[PDB]
RNA sequence: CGUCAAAACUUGUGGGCUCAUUCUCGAUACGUGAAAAGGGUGUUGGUGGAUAGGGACAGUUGGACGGUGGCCAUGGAAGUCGGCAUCCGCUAAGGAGUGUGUAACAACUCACCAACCGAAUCCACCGGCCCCGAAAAUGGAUGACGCUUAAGCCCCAUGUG
């Protein structure tokens, strides 16, 4: 992939300034959020629920962007919770192998949107992980896992008119599909 | 047709129950909320299924009775009398108002104006909320599919959205069924009537035990 | 979009096939039989030039996967006609009312039904060939044969449909001229 | 098991039972006589009535007619005289001084030599067949 | 009787289908979900009524 | 920001789903027929079970026999209109018998398994998009066209690599 849509930030935060909490105890996520404004919102938000704590009372120390390994595909497993359908939290497990976890989160979200129709708030993406065995579950990832996986493919595009030459006036020459 | 239940999909108004204020009270049919064995120690039905409402709805008695009897019918007919104890877990009572206009004091049209039009007793319904186990049925595990099938008539005797859930809870009773058995085994479980009682960690004065 | 892809063909042995275009041209014992297929093009790859041809797909959609088979089989059957041909047997069947069918050759004439009503006539399309055969206790019998089952069949099925009846109950209705054996002309090589 | 034709009915209490099964004097095999003739008249002095649908057994070399283990039948086959049956309609029966042959007789008697285990098969098997003819006689 | 074999053949023709209720559909033995679109392949299928 | 109609006919740099003989797939918020129930092996993606290579699953193939009615009602069912029934043997397995029905026997069948078989398959759930459900009066209107490797629906992006 990598249309790097979505961003990844790690947030590290703390409970009460108050000595009523003398000594707060500290929170981490690396979270895919498209900006930090959100990120911290989200961070806080489970804190406002799961942990019941209002942001306006407590304190995030940090929110810092978090980078992927390197240059190549690792097999990601994805775990999902979506709340919609006017019927709340529901789970799913899905599978992507790519080079970026981010691209995976990203791709999920469209995928859900297209694919389960969904919308983004309503998802809490639980997790993405590089899968080590030769599995790697899902049939489509396994499908294209093959050593010596290779292919044929045909029949599409390039923009026919254009400013990079050239709209309506075409063709100067003759036709088929071309390949 | 009938001042139909479809039409009463809203609520608008207050809760309208029976009240002193009520004196127009009509009376539906719908009677026997507990079916099967009503002295089924909890052990009798280990198993528990709820027939839940999905939400927010309003429901007529007519439907309610109809499923009841249906419930019993298929069930018993297939499966025996007690093999569950099918329990209507919902009592409902909310009182309906009628127009039913034109009480014949004049000619015809513009008969009323509105003239304290104001609702006559029409029926009972619950204007329901919060995914109520409607009927709860407690079984014995074996009798589960039979349990389900009645519900298939039963759902049909409502309209609207009602869902079918089995609970870890024992038959109208409490906890994941394995832990419940275990609960008896570990003794943390105590029998009352069909209904049953559970032990406190605050600990009071004194059931004592042995020995003399 | 998700890759099926498109392409061409599977194979057996002693019969030549087109291998090109939408069109399979199958040639064997009984001549050559050929068909042009529409969207039916699909992951070919020749495995032997003369000896192995398959088309058994890489990826694509659900619907796609079915076709692949349906395609082979039919062309296989193109081979079948070209090799061992088709022979359909029909027998006229009737009890209350006797029923007669002849064959003009170029056309099939059907008489008698229910005392006869209309005369059912079917022109003999190409290579469905028609024989009324009767000795050897060949019996109220038509034989349709040639090297295209689909045609031999189509004409045949057509016949079953030519002997339809309406009004006044299937529980007394039966009689008509029914398919009695759809086969090859023979076993052949 | 080991099944064979419909012999149908007894038709006469003397010799030559059945509607037309034993009417031929000699069959198509030339099978010889001993257990087919007056022996089935002699048999009638020990049993009568009910569904005598019979079976025919060609196993040795003399003609042989023998009754099925038919139900109601093989039970009333224990009696020693005729009280007068009065025709079988709705599985008829009558007293004749012989009962209680299940749980203390055949069940115990056949306990060490039967299909399956001592007290699971045989004893349990026999009981039902004349369960309501029980009377604790000595 | 046009011939027993024929009757057997015939029966296949004369009796052997189950039917989509909704659209009355003459359906197979093995039918599950009807072939008429507007019936949504509906699943109450009834057996052909035996003849008398 | 398709064309009517200004603006990527979005491509470099982008993703799915969705195909819709409907009077006809659908498609601007508000909006307002949001058809309803209620369905559909349309497609599309779960979850729970599985069985599963010591073989699963399909498809086959062979057998589905024997100790033995183990049985009772019963006009007549020895397994078999009906009803209480039921263990051993042989085994790979075969029911004291799955049906079909000679009034009943028979016969006919396979449930039961081996052998084949050789890989997924099997069940239930799931919920998604998609369709049936789906009838009135003037010709008719997603604005119109049309659009469907969209100009739909949904998704992201206008982005390196």
UniProtKB/Swiss-Prot annotation, chain E:
Q: Where in the cell is it found?
A: Cytoplasm
Provide the leader sequence positions. Answer: none
UniProt function note: Component of the 60S subunit of the ribosome.
Q: How does it assemble?
A: Part of the 60S ribosomal subunit.
Q: What's the protein called, per UniProt?
A: Large ribosomal subunit protein eL40
Originating organism: Trypanosoma brucei brucei
Q: Parent protein range shown?
A: 77 to 128 of 128
């Amino acid at each position: 992939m990598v249309r790097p849509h979505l961003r990844h930030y790690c947030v590290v935060g703390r409970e009460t300034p108050s000595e009523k909490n003398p000594q707060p105890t500290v929170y981490k996520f690396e979270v895919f959020a498209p900006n930090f404004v959100v990120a911290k919102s989200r961070f806080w938000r489970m804190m406002r629920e799961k942990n019941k704590v209002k942001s306006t009372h407590g304190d995030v120390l940090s929110c810092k962007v978090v980078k992927d390994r390197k240059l190549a595909a690792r097999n990601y497993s994805v775990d999902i919770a979506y709340y919609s359908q006017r019927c709340g939290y529901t789970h799913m497990v899905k599978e992507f192998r790519d080079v970026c976890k981010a691209g995976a989160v990203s791709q999920a979200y469209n995928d859900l949107a297209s694919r389960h129709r969904a919308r983004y708030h309503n998802i809490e993406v639980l997790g993405v992980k590089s899968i080590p065995n030769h599995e790697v579950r899902r049939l489509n990832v396994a499908q294209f896992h093959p050593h010596n996986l290779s292919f044929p493919l045909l029949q599409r595009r390039v923009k026919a008119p254009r400013k990079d030459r050239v709209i309506f006036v075409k063709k100067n020459s003759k036709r088929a599909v071309v390949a | 047709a009938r001042r139909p239940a479809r039409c009463y999909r809203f609520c608008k108004n207050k809760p309208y129950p029976k009240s002193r204020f009520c004196r127009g009270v009509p009376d539906p049919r719908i009677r026997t909320f507990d079916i099967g064995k009503r002295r089924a120690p909890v052990d009798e039905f280990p198993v528990c299924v709820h027939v839940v409402s999905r939400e927010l709805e309003q429901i007529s008695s007519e439907a309610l009775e109809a499923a009841r009897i249906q419930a019993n019918k298929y069930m018993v007919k297939r499966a025996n009398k007690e093999c569950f104890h099918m329990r209507i877990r919902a009592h409902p009572f909310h009182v309906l108002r009628i127009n039913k206009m034109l009480s014949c004091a004049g000619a015809d049209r513009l008969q009323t104006g509105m003239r304290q039009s104001y609702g006559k007793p029409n029926g009972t319904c619950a204007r329901v909320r919060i995914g109520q186990i409607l009927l709860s049925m407690r079984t014995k595990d074996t009798y589960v599919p039979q349990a389900l099938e009645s519900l298939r008539r039963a759902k049909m005797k409502f309209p609207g959205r009602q869902i079918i859930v089995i609970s870890k809870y024992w038959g109208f009773t409490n906890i994941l069924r394995n832990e419940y058995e275990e609960l008896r085994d570990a003794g943390k479980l105590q029998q009352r009537g069909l209904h049953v009682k559970l032990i406190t960690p605050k600990g009071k004065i004194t059931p004592y035990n042995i020995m003399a | 979009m998700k890759i099926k892809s498109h392409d061409q063909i599977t194979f057996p042995e002693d019969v030549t096939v087109s291998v090109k275009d939408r069109i399979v041209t199958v040639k064997g014992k009984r001549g050559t039989l050929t068909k042009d297929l529409r969207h039916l093009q699909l992951d070919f790859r020749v495995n032997k030039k003369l000896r192995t041809f398959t088309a058994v797909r890489w990826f694509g959609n659900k619907i796609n996967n079915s076709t692949i088979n349906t395609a082979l089989s039919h062309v296989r059957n193109m081979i079948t006609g070209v090799t061992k041909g088709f022979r359909f047997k029909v027998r006229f069947a009737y009890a209350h009312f006797p029923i007669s069918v002849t064959v003009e050759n170029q056309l099939v004439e059907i008489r008698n039904f229910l005392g006869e009503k209309r005369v059912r006539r079917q022109v003999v399309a190409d290579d469905v060939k028609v024989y009324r055969t009767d000795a050897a206790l060949v019996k109220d019998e038509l034989v349709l044969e040639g090297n295209d089952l689909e045609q031999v069949s189509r004409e045949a099925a057509v016949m079953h449909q030519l002997c339809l009846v309406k009004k006044k109950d299937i529980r007394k209705f039966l009689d008509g001229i029914y398919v009695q054996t759809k086969t090859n002309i023979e076993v052949d090589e | 098991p080991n099944q064979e034709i419909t012999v149908v009915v007894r038709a006469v209490g003397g010799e030559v039972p059945a509607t037309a099964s034993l009417a031929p004097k000699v069959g198509p095999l030339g099978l010889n006589a001993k257990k087919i003739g007056e022996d089935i008249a002699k048999s009638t002095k020990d049993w009568k009535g009910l569904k005598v649908t019979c079976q025919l057994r060609v196993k040795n070399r003399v003609a042989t007619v023998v009754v099925t283990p038919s139900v109601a039948s093989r039970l009333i086959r224990a009696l020693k005289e005729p009280p007068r049956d009065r025709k079988k309609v709705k599985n008829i029966k009558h007293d004749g001084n012989i009962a209680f042959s299940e749980i203390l007789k055949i069940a115990k008697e056949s306990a060490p030599n039967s299909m399956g285990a001592s007290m699971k098969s045989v004893v349990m098997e026999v009981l039902g067949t004349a369960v309501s003819i029980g009377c604790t006689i000595d | 009787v046009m011939e027993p074999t024929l009757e057997a053949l015939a029966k296949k023709y004369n009796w052997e289908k189950k039917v989509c209720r909704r659209c009355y559909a003459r359906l197979p033995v093995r039918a599950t979900n009807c072939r008429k679109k507007g019936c949504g392949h509906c699943s109450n299928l009834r057996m052909k009524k035996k003849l008398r």
